[PDB]
Structures are given as C-alpha cells and as structure tokens.
Amino acid sequence: HASSDQGKTVSRATTNSKTDANTVGVSISAGYQNGFTGNITTSYSHTTDNSTAVQDSNGESWNTGLSINKGESAYINANVRYYNTGTAPMYKVTPTTNLVLDGETLATIKAQDNQIGNNLSPNETYPKKGLSPLALNTMDQFNARLIPINYDQLKKLDSGKQIKLETTQVSGNYGTKNSQGQIITEGNSWSNYISQIDSVSASII
Amino acid sequence: TAVQDSNGESWNTGLSINKGESAYINANVRYYNTGTAPMYKVTPTTNLVLDGETLATIKAQDNQIGNNLSPNETYPKKGLSPLALNTMDQFNARLIPINYDQLKKLDSGKQIKLETTQVSGNYGTKNSQGQIITEGNSWSNYISQIDSVSASII
Amino acid sequence: HASSDQGKTVSRATTNSKTDANTVGVSISAGYQNGFTGNITTSYSHTTDNS
Numbered sequence: 001h002a003s004s005d006q007g008k009t010v011s012r013a014t015t016n017s018k019t020d021a022n023t024v025g026v027s028i029s030a031g032y033q034n035g036f037t038g039n040i041t042t043s044y045s046h047t048t049d050n051s052t053a054v055q056d057s058n059g060e061s062w063n064t065g066l067s068i069n070k071g072e073s074a075y076i077n078a079n080v081r082y083y084n085t086g087t088a089p090m091y092k093v094t095p096t097t098n099l100v101l102d103g104e105t106l107a108t109i110k111a112q113d114n115q116i117g118n119n120l121s122p123n124e125t126y127p128k129k130g131l132s133p134l135a136l137n138t139m140d141q142f143n144a145r146l147i148p149i150n151y152d153q154l155k156k157l158d159s160g161k162q163i164k165l166e167t168t169q170v171s172g173n174y175g176t177k178n179s180q181g182q183i184i185t186e187g188n189s190w191s192n193y194i195s196q197i198d199s200v201s202a203s204i205i
Numbered sequence: 206t207a208v209q210d211s212n213g214e215s216w217n218t219g220l221s222i223n224k225g226e227s228a229y230i231n232a233n234v235r236y237y238n239t240g241t242a243p244m245y246k247v248t249p250t251t252n253l254v255l256d257g258e259t260l261a262t263i264k265a266q267d268n269q270i271g272n273n274l275s276p277n278e279t280y281p282k283k284g285l286s287p288l289a290l291n292t293m294d295q296f297n298a299r300l301i302p303i304n305y306d307q308l309k310k311l312d313s314g315k316q317i318k319l320e321t322t323q324v325s326g327n328y329g330t331k332n333s334q335g336q337i338i339t340e341g342n343s344w345s346n347y348i349s350q351i352d353s354v355s356a357s358i359i
Numbered sequence: 360h361a362s363s364d365q366g367k368t369v370s371r372a373t374t375n376s377k378t379d380a381n382t383v384g385v386s387i388s389a390g391y392q393n394g395f396t397g398n399i400t401t402s403y404s405h406t407t408d409n410s
Binding site for chain 2: 001002003004005006007008009010011012013014015016017018019051059074075079089091112113114115117118119121126127128131132133134135137138142143144175182183184185186
C-alpha cells in the first residue's frame with residue numbers, strides 16, 4: 001500500500017511586550033590627583049519599554065509511505081494448460097495441483113468454475129492449441145479469494161527460486177447413452193474406475 | 206510581560222493506491238452464433254490477455270448468460286448495446302483486478318485481448334406435444350463426438 | 360503490518376519588530392577633592408528601534 005501527501009501552511013503571530021527596569025548603584029573613587037581625592041557617587045534610573053513584533057510564516061511538506069502485511073505479502077497467478085494423452089475424452093475436467101516453492105507446498109488448488117474444461121479429447125489440450133493458457137487465479141470455492149504468499153516466500157521468490165506445479169489428481173466424466181439416445185455425463189465419474197483399471201492392467205507408454 | 210496572538214491555516218492533499226489491486230477491468234462483449242442450431246443458456250469462458258500473460262479467465266455468471274441465441278444472430282440483439290463483464294466470482298460480487306505493472310502497461314499502447322476458450326449451452330428436446338426441455342441437455346456432451354466424425358467447411 | 364514513512368519540509372518565516380524605550384535618571388555625588396565637590400545630575404533618553 002503506497003501513499004503520498006502534500007502540505008501547505010500559513011501563520012501570523014503578533015507579540016506585544018512591555019518592560020520595567022530599575023537600577024541603583026554606588027561608585028566610590030579614591031585616587032591621589034595631586035595630594036588626595038575622594039568621591040562617593042549614587043545613582044538611580046528607571047526604563048520603560050514597549051515592543052511590537054509581527055511574524056509571517058509559510059510552510060510546505062510532502063510525505064511518501066509504503067506498508068505491507070507480512071502474512072499476505074503477494075498474490076500468485078499461474079497460467080496453466082491441460083493435456084490428454086490417453087484414449088478416451090474427459091468431460092468437466094477438474095484438476096488438483098500443488099504449488100511448490102523450495103521444498104514447501106504453498107497451496108493445493110482444485111479447479112473451480114473459471115478453470116474447468118468442458119471437453120478434453122485425446123491428443124488435445126485445454127485451451128486449444130492456438131489459444132492462451134488459463135489463469136489459475138483463486139483458491140476458494142467461488143473464485144473470490146486470491147492465492148496468497150507470505151513475506152519470506154516473496155523474498156525467496158525475488159531470487160533464483162521458482163514455483164513448480166504438480167498435478168496430484170484430475171477429476172472428470174465419461175459419456176453414456178441413457179434410456180433414449182441422449183448422452184449423459186453428469187453422474188458418471190472417472191474416479192470410480194481409476195484404481196480398478198490400474199489394478200488389472202499393464203501400463204505401456 | 207508579553208502577549209502573543211497566533212493564527213494558522215493549512216490544507217493537505219493526498220492519494221494512496223494498493224499495488225495488488227490497482228484497477229478494475231470492465232469489458233463490453235457480444236456473442237455470435239454462426240452454426241445451424243440455437244444455443245440456450247449461453248455460457249462463454251473467456252481469456253483476458255495483456256502482453257503475453259492471461260490476467261483472468263472469466264466464465265459468464267447470471268448477469269452475462271444469454272437466454273436464446275439463434276443461428277446468424279447475436280446476444281444482445283443487433284440494435285442493442287454490448288454486455289458488461291464486470292465480475293469474476295460466482296455470485297457477481299467481485300470485480301476483476303489487475304495489479305500495478307499491468308496497469309502501467311495499460312496506460313500505454315498496450316491493449317487487452319479477449320479470446321473465448323469454450324462455450325457452454327443447452328439444446329431443446331420436444332415430446333409427443335410441443336413441450337420443450339433444455340435442462341439436462343448439454344451441447345458439451347456432443348461437441349467432441351461431432352468433431353470426431355465430421356469434416357469442417359467454412 | 361509493517362509500515363514506513365519519509366517526509367521533507369521547507370519553510371520561511373519573516374519578522375518585523377518595533378520597540379520604544381524611555382529612561383530617566385538621578386545621580387548624586389560627593390567629593391573631598393581638596394576641600395569639597397558635590398553635584399546632582401538628571402538624565403533622560405529615548406530609544407527607537409527597528410529590526
């Protein structure tokens with residue numbers, strides 16, 4: 001949070017003094033001019049004073065400030081893309097990714113509405129080849145809470161340190177034909193079949 | 206004895222900004238249908254790209270959903286003004302932020318581009334009578350299947 | 360929440376004064392120089408000022 005101010009000041013004083021001063025004093029002299037001399041002097045005085053001072057002033061100032069919260073020092077935005085290298089398409093693609101920075105995981109984000117790919121056909125990407133990558137922008141369920149990092153991670157990030165991204169799992173759907181010729185992909189989840197397919201297969205890449 | 210009488214006056218002016226949410230973006234858009242079927246409940250997902258990076262990927266919520274979109278037409282219709290893409294959350298209550306460096310780029314020749322990555326919408330199915338239903342009917346269930354058995358002609 | 364500030368200030372004040380001063384005085388002396396000498400004195404002043 002940066003800040004900046006300007007100032008301007010005017011002033012006017014007016015002093016009115018008044019003074020009294022008595023002064024009494026004795027001075028004695030004794031010095032042989034030719035044969036002898038003596039003198040005893042006494043004096044009195046009284047002074048009266050009046051003053052009149054006027055003063056004008058003109059001031060200026062400018063300030064600049066800079067604040068920071070050390071627990072939410074910066075917000076992170078990742079630009080990602082999905083790939084399908086299998087044999088079947090996946091609908092409503094919902095990935096879950098880790099954001100890792102120097103041995104610690106900053107956040108685990110599941111894709112909400114703004115980041116879900118409706119179709120993802122094999123050998124294709126979301127968004128498609130000619131488009132720009134997504135914005136993995138927020139962390140909450142309603143795409144309204146940005147992904148924060150604290151001050152030590154931000155300082156570590158103004159250096160050679162980078163943030164990696166790891167897909168821990170991906171959720172999605174498959175299409176079946178319902179009682180009529182209509183395709184349904186709503187309650188048909190691929191996660192019901194991942195462990196079972198992996199458990200009875202050999203994997204060739 | 207001294208008696209001093211003073212009179213002052215001052216006026217300050219200031220301005221502060223947050224460098225993480227320096228500005229808010231508001232794009233005006235219009236949808237187009239160049240196919241052969243009308244799409245109901247049109248829900249586009251768009252990228253907002255400024256100088257090589259995507260600022261935000263917004264999906265159309267209640268305010269930005271088009272009820273009908275027939276072939277060769279637009280939403281909103283031809284004689285009307287374009288929509289407003291204000292918010293990024295699900296309930297239309299959170300404006301779209303850009304940070305300070307992106308704002309600085311924006312106060313120059315730099316322009317923000319918009320590209321649609323996907324569009325979601327429904328089709329209609331009648332019954333014995335003319336009762337049309339467009340709720341469980343999703344075009345995304347058929348987009349890939351249609352692309353996989355066809356030849357494109359533009 | 361850690362903050363920080365930096366200020367700078369410039370000013371200029373001008374003053375105009377004016378002062379009056381009256382003064383009286385009495386002086387008494389005595390002197391046995393050779394036989395005697397003695398004098399009384401009365402003084403007065405008026406100072407005007409500008410600064």
